[PDB]
């Protein structure tokens, strides 16, 4: 269809813009996480925290890099509310919703399909995108070893701890916290397996 074709192409341009936005945020978060990993200026805790956070972010981004948009919910009230497997908003235009998350409460009317009982939805298009390009318009109006293993690991970690200096031998400003009183050999073993 000529109209189907023009639409399909416009929606493809829209999704390509969304994907370019995504790629930009991806490079941004990557660079930020890199330069926080290297120096970060501050101290450990904040550095590790920022790192884990930007890692979660890079995940949340990449996880949806193939099949981001799920469809549309053009509403009765001359208004649209696109959908996808992520959240994307125009930080400038007062966070107008360009792409809700499939979990949101405003995106529950992507799974209610009745015999003319819509909340405020009139048209509904479930796109058959492959990974990055829209195709369809779809209107829907031996418990012996383990013992010795674990015991040898416990003993190795106990030796590790006995290896570090102790408070009866320190040469520091004031008695601070030490490995020997925050974690036990057995957890220092669990956390390397």
């Amino acid at each position: 269809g000529r109209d189907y074709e023009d639409e399909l192409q416009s929606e493809r341009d829209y999704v390509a813009g969304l994907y370019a936005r995504l790629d930009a945020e991806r490079a941004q978060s990557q660079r930020r996480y890199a330069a926080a990993l290297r120096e970060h200026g501050g101290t450990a805790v904040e550095r590790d925290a920022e790192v884990r956070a930007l890692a979660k972010d890079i995940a949340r981004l990449n996880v949806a890099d193939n099949g981001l948009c799920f469809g549309r919910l053009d509403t009765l009230d001359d208004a649209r509310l696109y959908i996808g497997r992520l959240g994307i908003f125009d930080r400038d235009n007062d966070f107008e919703p360009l792409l809700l998350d499939w979990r949101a409460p405003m995106a529950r009317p992507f799974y209610v399909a009745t015999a003319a009982n819509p909340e405020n939805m009139r048209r509904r298009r479930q796109f058959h995108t492959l990974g990055r390009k829209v195709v369809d318009f779809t209107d829907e109006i031996a418990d012996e070893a383990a013992e010795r293993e674990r015991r040898e690991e416990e003993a190795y970690a106990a030796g590790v701890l006995d290896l570090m200096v102790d408070r009866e031998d320190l040469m520091d400003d004031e008695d601070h916290l030490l490995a020997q009183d925050l974690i036990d050999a057995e957890e220092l073993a669990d956390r390397f397996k």
Binding site: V45, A53, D94, P97, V160, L161, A179, L182
Partner: protein, 146 residues
């Protein structure tokens, strides 16, 4: 009187607080979820801290004692300086997670109380993590020597 505050700072904070208000709306309007909201706020305030940093080091003179102590690689970073004259910024829960309520006050303008009762969590967390770090290091080292 040598620890200088940049004057392009309050504009910044009001702008970004307006953005945060918009997000609060998008949360109350059923258009978003809690944790993604907090992530968005985090993004915004990190951007604001970066802006503050660039403005600060665009405003300080070239002969200032602090900037000279830093730029000569002797001591410190521009994060310490930003926090001493700009805004400490976001801080962490005891679970590592960030908080969307930042610290918009520096160690010169003077912190408030509740902008000071959330700055402890990470401090104690770090003063305890140091020892475990030393322990894992000793472990790796004893192994590599074995």
């Amino acid at each position: 009187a040598d620890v200088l505050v940049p004057p392009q700072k309050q504009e910044i904070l009001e702008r970004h607080e307006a953005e945060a208000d918009a997000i609060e709306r998008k949360y109350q309007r059923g258009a978003l979820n809690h944790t993604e909201r907090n992530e968005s706020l985090v993004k915004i305030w990190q951007d604001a801290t970066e802006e503050v940093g660039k403005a600060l080091e665009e405003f300080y003179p070239a002969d200032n004692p602090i900037i000279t102590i830093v730029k000569s690689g002797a001591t410190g970073n521009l994060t310490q300086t930003r926090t001493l004259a700009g805004m400490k910024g976001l801080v962490t829960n005891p679970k590592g997670e960030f908080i969307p309520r930042p610290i918009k006050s520096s160690f010169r303008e003077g912190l408030t109380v509740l902008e000071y009762f959330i700055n402890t969590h990470g401090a104690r967390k770090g003063l305890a993590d140091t020892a475990l770090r030393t322990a894992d290091s000793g472990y790796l080292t004893r192994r590599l020597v074995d």
